[PDB]
C-alpha cells in the first residue's frame, strides 16, 4: 500500500476526490487534521479496498513505525515518512489499502 504526505487540510479534499470518498469521509479527515493540529500530535488515516476510512493517533514515531508496519506499507516508506516527521512537515499522513499488484521469479 502506498502513503501520501499531508501538511494542508486543501490536500485532504484533492486526495478524497482521488480515492473516490463520501462528504462525510471528506469532513472527517478535515476534523481529525484540524484536532491533530490544535494537540500536537500526528495522525494516520488508512483507505481500505472496500472504500472505507479509519484512524489512528500517536504519542512517538515509534508507535508509527509499529502501525505503518500493521498497515503493510513498504519499508522505504516508513523509514523516509520517518524524515519528513524528525522535520515537522506533515501533519496528517493517507494510506491506500487498495494497491494491490503482483511480482514472482523462477
Known amino acids: 500500500g502506498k502513503l501520501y504526505e499531508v501538511d494542508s487540510p486543501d490536500s485532504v479534499e484533492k486526495i478524497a476526490r482521488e480515492?473516490?470518498?463520501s462528504e462525510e469521509q471528506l469532513r472527517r479527515i478535515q476534523k481529525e487534521f484540524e484536532r491533530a493540529e490544535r494537540k500536537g500530535k500526528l495522525v494516520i488515516v488508512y483507505l481500505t479496498s472496500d472504500g472505507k476510512v479509519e484512524i489512528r493517533e500517536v504519542t512517538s514515531e515509534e508507535e508509527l513505525e509499529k502501525i505503518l508496519k500493521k498497515l503493510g506499507v513498504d519499508e522505504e516508506i516508513?523509514?523516509?515518512?520517518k524524515r519528513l516527521r524528525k522535520e515537522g512537515q506533515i501533519k496528517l499522513v493517507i494510506i491506500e489499502g487498495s494497491l494491490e499488484h503482483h511480482h514472482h521469479h523462477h
Open 19 to 21: 480515492l473516490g470518498l
Open 78 to 81: 516508513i523509514r523516509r515518512i
